[PDB]
């Protein structure tokens, strides 16, 4: 475990890390002392002989240099001490141990390594200071702060080895992770606070600031966009200048809780051809969200374009925020006099409620709830009463916060802070708890020697009425310290137990690998799964799509999907097709549309059998929503001209498309049924959206566009298939163990103790429960 499964290595480095907004995503700032120390063996060719001879001439004391020269004899020429470090003549086939240089592939690591995304390859950028520089949008997969954290660096020593870093372990390749099937990187904490303030309707930018912001985008085309305001003064909106970093052909639609197309609260997000329309950009758009900007750009444009997208969003927003400014003071914690008076009114009326229940319980007039004691009914009611007061008075403060309140702006952008931080700072930190209950009678029948015995009041049992702004009393201070100590014990306990959980998960699943027959097996050849994930798809190219056959009335399903050519009221209108009048009454084609409608009926019954609750949004391989918008833009589609798609074109085209979604290729009835079972959910999504009425009426595709959608779907499906050799068991164990390490906290055992019960199968469970219907 200490010299074979892991060992100390040469060509390693370690130092403190810091952030660099002017670095790239897959770049790493390397100190020149380290770059002078670490070497790479480069064999001389005609393509490097002139450069390598200069590096030897530069020597090992200043960068870019070299430290050793290896001949065919195999003896190293120490360039520090050799008398012939001036008259070297590099014969071909020799090795030159040059310095680490710019754009070299190196492995960057942050410990504990609970992730494949904790050890991923970076590009060298030699920097003139003593720290490892890295982009801010790579901190989240490392869980790396800049308060003194350290990171490691490993240097490959052969061309085969550098290939694995650049082509497998590179940073842009790990942006959209198989763990949680979503991107793990995103805009964070200054870009995030800035990209909200930039993208308000009230934020307009003048000409002088726009041109600096425009030239700050590296791959800019030189075209100055036309200002959104022209006549009184040429102003650009913040939405305008931000859209220059977004590539063309990006479509993003999201509706947030009030989002008409007029969008009065400026919420939601519509992005049309790389230019945003009416959305304020915040964490839901630009964070590490499912179906965000990063998720779209990585899938549509690619990893390299998305890695460029991080820096371009950062270089524009960090520029604007540097000349805008943003602070936070104690004034951002103060609510109004009227608001503070109503807050202490809210606490007083809840303390009177505890007094009345206490007087009720004292006269034995309490009715005990079923299955619990008289005291347990009392404790449950008082904790509920005091938590109601802390939450209501906190919401009384959060409503009072203005839009200029800087704590609110970080909350509104989602960069840092929550509601409870506002509540505990400005209104009431609230009830403290040890071991789930209130503060125990550590003394005989009291909590502190400043109380009389048998005192169950909020003050006695550890309710902190004051906020951090108002200042805690000495009793409030001690009870807060008593609960706060418990969190420090829980943090130290859960970190040690989860590290054992993650190691146990890994060591059991370390040999589970997808083989070339798509079977998920182990070293013995035993089948764990016959198809990986039961469907054979790499979780990186998987996202949530709605199966919209599940929901709606039986009439609305009929109104949207049924085509009756033998009817005149329920037929395809001649507006939708060049054959609108020719096709009416066709018997040989209505048998096709009755065949298609029978599968949509059969699939809808099948999907309700699987998803009993009626949930439509489920992770599926190929995002068909985006391919339709891609078709409406590539082939410029008007919704007035009729299509040229035959009934036979759509129906027999989709059935031919399903024949080409291959996951397994065996020519026998078992594998063909394994294949037909593995693609059933996707073909349920395929027929629901490539149905005849939906294409001709809602999409209005041409035959050119329809054949293009069929080509993309077949292409994106085959890319989403798992690659044989994928060590999916280690990936499975780390995808569970890492979010377990972030677990930290109504009578059921949950979280880390329950996960320890499940993995270490508990013959004596802490909370067995039976759910009876």
């Amino acid at each position: 475990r200490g010299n074979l499964m892991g060992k100390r290595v040469d060509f390693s480095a370690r130092t403190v890390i810091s952030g660099d907004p002017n670095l790239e995503l897959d770049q790493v700032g390397v100190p020149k002392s380290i770059a002078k120390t670490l070497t790479y063996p480069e064999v001389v060719t005609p393509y490097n002989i002139d450069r390598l001879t200069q590096l030897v001439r530069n020597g090992p004391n200043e960068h870019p240099g070299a430290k050793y020269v290896i001949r065919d004899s195999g003896d190293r020429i120490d360039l520090r001490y050799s008398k012939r470090a001036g008259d070297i003549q590099l014969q071909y086939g020799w090795k030159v141990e040059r310095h680490i240089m710019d754009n070299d592939p190196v492995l960057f690591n942050r410990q504990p390594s609970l992730h494949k995304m904790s050890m991923m390859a970076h590009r060298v950028k030699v920097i003139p200071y003593s720290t490892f520089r890295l982009n801010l949008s790579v901190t989240s997969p490392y869980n790396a702060d800049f308060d003194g954290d350290e990171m490691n660096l490993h240097v490959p020593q052969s061309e085969e080895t550098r290939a694995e870093l650049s082509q497998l372990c590179a940073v842009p390749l790990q942006i959209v992770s198989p763990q949680s099937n979503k991107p793990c990187m995103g805009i964070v904490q200054d870009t995030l606070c800035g990209i909200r303030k930039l993208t308000l309707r009230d934020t307009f930018i003048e000409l002088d600031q726009v041109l600096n912001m425009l030239y700050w985008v590296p791959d800019w085309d030189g075209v100055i966009p036309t200002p959104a305001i022209i006549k009184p003064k040429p102003l650009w909106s913040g939405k305008q200048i931000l859209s220059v970093a977004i590539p063309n052909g990006i479509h993003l639609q999201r509706f947030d809780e009030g989002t008409t197309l007029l969008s009065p609260k400026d919420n939601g997000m519509l992005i049309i051809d790389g230019q945003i329309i009416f959305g304020v950009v915040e964490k839901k758009t630009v964070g590490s969200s499912n179906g965000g900007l990063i998720h779209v750009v990585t899938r549509e444009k690619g990893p390299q374009v998305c890695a460029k997208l991080f820096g371009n969003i950062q270089k524009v927003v960090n520029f604007w925020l540097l000349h805008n400014g943003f602070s936070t003071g104690i004034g951002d914690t103060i609510a109004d006099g009227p608001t503070m008076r109503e807050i202490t009114e809210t606490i007083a009326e809840a303390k009177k409620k505890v007094l009345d229940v206490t007087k009720e319980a004292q006269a034995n007039l309490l009715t005990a709830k079923h299955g619990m004691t008289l005291r347990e009914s009392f404790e449950d009611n008082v904790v509920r009463f005091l938590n109601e007061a802390r939450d209501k008075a906190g919401r009384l403060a959060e409503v009072n916060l203005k839009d200029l309140n800087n704590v609110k702006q970080m909350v509104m952008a989602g960069s840092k802070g929550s509601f409870i931080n506002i509540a505990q700072m400005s209104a009431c930190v609230g009830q403290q708890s040890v071991e789930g209950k209130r503060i125990a009678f550590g003394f005989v029948d009291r909590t502190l020697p400043h109380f009389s015995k048998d005192d169950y009041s909020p003050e006695s049992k550890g309710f902190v009425e004051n906020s951090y702004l108002r200042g805690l009393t000495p009793q409030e201070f001690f009870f807060h310290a008593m609960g706060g100590r418990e969190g420090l014990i829980d943090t130290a306990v859960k970190t040690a137990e989860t590290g054992y959980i993650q190691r146990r998960l890994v060591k059991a699943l370390e040999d589970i690998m997808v083989h070339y027959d798509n079977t998920t097996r182990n070293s013995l050849g035993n089948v764990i799964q016959f198809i990986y994930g039961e469907d054979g798809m790499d979780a990186a190219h998987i996202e949530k799509q709605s199966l919209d056959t599940i929901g709606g009335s039986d009439a609305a399903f009929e109104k949207r999907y049924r085509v009756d050519l033998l009817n005149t009221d329920h037929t395809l209108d001649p507006s939708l097709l060049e054959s609108g009048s020719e096709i009416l009454g066709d018997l040989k084609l209505q048998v096709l549309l009755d065949e298609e409608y029978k599968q949509l009926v059969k699939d809808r019954k099948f999907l309700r059998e699987v998803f009993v609750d009626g949930e439509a949004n489920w992770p599926l391989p190929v995002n068909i929503r985006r391919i339709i918008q891609n078709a409406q833009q590539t082939f410029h589609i008007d919704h007035t001209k009729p299509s040229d798609l035959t009934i036979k074109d759509i129906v027999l085209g989709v059935k031919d498309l399903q024949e080409n979604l291959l996951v397994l290729r065996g020519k026998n009835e078992i594998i063909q049924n394994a294949q037909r079972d593995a693609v059933t959910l996707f073909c349920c999504l395929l027929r629901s959206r490539l149905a005849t009425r939906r294409v001709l009426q809602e999409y209005r595709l041409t035959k050119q566009a329809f054949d293009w959608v069929l080509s993309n779907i077949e292409a994106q499906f085959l890319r989403s298939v798992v690659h044989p050799g994928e060590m999916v068991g280690v990936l499975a164990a780390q995808s569970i163990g890492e979010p377990a390490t972030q677990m930290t906290l109504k009578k059921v055992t949950s979280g880390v103790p329950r996960l320890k019960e499940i993995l270490n199968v508990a013959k004596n469970m802490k909370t067995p429960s039976l759910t009876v219907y």
Partner: protein, 114 residues
Amino acid sequence: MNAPDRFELFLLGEGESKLKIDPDTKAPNAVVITFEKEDHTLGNLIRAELLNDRKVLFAAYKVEHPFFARFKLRIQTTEGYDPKDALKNACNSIINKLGALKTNFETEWNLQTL
């Protein structure tokens, strides 16, 4: 330890010139001038003066890293207008403005007491 010498903020190294002029790609009559060993003192003053000449279409400066004292200036001018002449007239207009500033201060200084 790793920190560079402080004179590199203003002292040109070996093989380094003060200005480097490079033609812009996909931008007609536009140029990118790499100013070496300078900072926002010069770049913000040159750029703001290029905005006052009404034959200049684009003027912007940026420091690609605070580690290194250098910046890039991009100028785009009208057809038949070398941006170097736009840079020359902007630089010369800075000097004549500072020349009058120096004279008007020395006039008001000698008028004062204490």
